[PDB]
């Protein structure tokens, strides 16, 4: 469970349910909850021409680190990626539930290994899920942001992971944790649709609570 006087949490207009800021002003309103409800997940889909989706990934992450930094707003960001310069590329700033970020300024103090943790997608699915569980369990009472900066990037995800039982097993298992700790966990993922076959994309979409398509940034959503 979490804290009531948590600044990163707030009830959605549409529902009684606790939600959190995507770190993206506009995006929050479009979701329909003025944010992403705890225990839910979004998949953001983008065309090849980068990198508006890696931007929303970084906003989502940055929003969580600021929360962690002064009541309270304790959060822990988990990143499933091989690129650790994701943590150094997060935007800086400028209730206290959403902030206006600046894509040109980095974050004032660099994120510490205790504020943010990386997990490599170059591992077995069993291992990845274990890490995410274990990280969630030891940061008990902390709000938990899971960010998957670009699902199935071929430079980060081994060919064998593209087998259905691997990637969908991974997504099923992550979805299982999101619902299991619905009290405080949330998931953001992005994916480039040019390297995913339509069947697999259909499978993927089914593991997420909401799916957002970006065409250049205009957002057509599937709630």
């Amino acid at each position: 469970g979490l804290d009531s006087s948590h600044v990163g949490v707030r009830p959605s207009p549409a529902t009684s349910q606790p939600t959190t800021s995507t770190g993206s002003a506009d995006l929050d309103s479009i979701l329909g909850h003025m944010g992403l409800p705890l225990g839910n997940s979004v998949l953001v889909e983008e065309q090849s021409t980068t990198e508006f989706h890696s931007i929303l990934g970084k906003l989502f992450a940055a929003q969580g680190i600021v929360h962690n930094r002064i009541r309270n707003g304790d959060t822990h960001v988990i990143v499933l990626s091989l690129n650790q310069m994701f943590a150094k590329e997060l935007p800086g700033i400028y209730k206290d539930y959403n902030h206006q970020f600046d894509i040109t300024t980095r974050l004032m103090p660099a994120p510490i290994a205790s504020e943010l943790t990386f997990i490599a997608p170059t591992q077995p699915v069993s291992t990845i899920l274990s890490q995410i569980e274990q990280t969630i369990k030891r940061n008990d009472k902390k709000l938990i942001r899971i960010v998957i900066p670009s699902l199935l990037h071929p430079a980060m995800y081994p060919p064998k992971m593209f087998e259905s039982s691997e990637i969908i097993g991974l997504m099923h298992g992550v979805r299982s944790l999101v619902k299991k700790y619905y009290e405080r966990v949330v998931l953001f993922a992005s994916i480039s649709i040019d390297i995913i076959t339509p069947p697999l994309l259909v499978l993927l979409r089914n593991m997420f609570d909401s799916v957002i398509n970006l065409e250049p940034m205009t957002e057509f959503l599937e709630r």
Binding site: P199, N206, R223
Partner: protein, 271 residues
């Protein structure tokens, strides 16, 4: 808006779920239900539970249909590969279905990690099956079984073919219960510019197969043109490929198309 509501009718005896499918000595019937991602089936699942346990789907229909003169030991086993148990218990409680009337089997929570990972194909299928056997063997003759998204097993279990899924799980499961409802997501058929890949031809076979074995097929689809405020989608009632198993050859599916509005609280049907 101020639309003219219709009651759901599936069979010619005017019912949604004829109670006589349940005390019979030797019969097995399959409903196959298909929906797209944008048209969630929960209101249908809960309506069927409600009809079986309380005699009529109060959540869908204005008036009541003919029912049994005394309360039975009517029971529902709900299983999902895509939603956790909270998802059903929360909506069933909101709907005021008493807890003793149903049992939820959760094949999302820790399912990959505990039940799939270090474990061969047969063993996975055999132990999923076994969970249903145990649960059914409590009111075996009076239980409805509802399974959401078993197709997921075709994606989650490495090298599972449609025929193995049917032979080692679906068909044996149907043999142990009076009524089986399969709820399946039909998005794989709905990709613009895409038909008949190998993993997906294996997947598509499952829908053709389930339809062939089903005596009734219900389909939820979104508006073909776009998304609206006070219109959710359409509901088609069709014959399946199998005959209805009863000693009542007059009984038939009443084919129909409805429009429906799935509101937060209630859902309503209208022509």
């Amino acid at each position: 808006g101020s639309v003219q509501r219709q009651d759901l009718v599936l069979f010619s005896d005017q019912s949604v779920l004829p109670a006589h499918f349940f005390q019979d000595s030797n019969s097995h019937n399959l409903f196959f239900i298909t929906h797209q991602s944008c048209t969630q089936p929960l209101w249908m699942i809960n309506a069927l539970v409600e009809t079986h346990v309380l005699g009529s789907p109060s959540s869908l229909n204005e008036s009541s249909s003919s029912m049994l003169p005394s309360s039975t030991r009517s029971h529902a086993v709900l299983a999902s590969f895509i939603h956790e148990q909270n998802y059903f218990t929360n909506s069933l409680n909101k709907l005021k279905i008493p807890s003793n009337n149903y049992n939820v089997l959760d094949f999302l929570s820790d399912f990959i990690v505990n039940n799939i990972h270090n474990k061969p194909r047969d063993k996975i299928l055999s132990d999923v099956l076994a969970k249903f056997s145990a649960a059914i063997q409590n009111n075996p003759t009076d239980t409805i079984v509802i399974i959401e998204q078993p197709e997921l097993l075709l994606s989650l279990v490495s090298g599972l073919t449609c025929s193995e899924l049917n032979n080692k799980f679906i068909t044996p499961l149907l043999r142990q219960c009076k009524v089986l409802i399969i709820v399946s997501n039909s998005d794989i058929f709905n990709i613009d510019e895409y038909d008949a890949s190998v993993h997906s031809s294996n997947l598509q076979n499952f829908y053709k197969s389930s339809f062939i074995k089903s005596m009734i097929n219900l389909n939820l689809n979104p508006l073909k043109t776009g998304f609206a405020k006070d219109v959710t989608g359409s509901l088609h009632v069709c014959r399946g490929g199998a005959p209805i198993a009863t000693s009542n050859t007059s009984l038939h599916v009443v084919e129909n198309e409805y429009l429906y509005l799935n509101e937060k609280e209630s859902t309503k049907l209208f022509y």
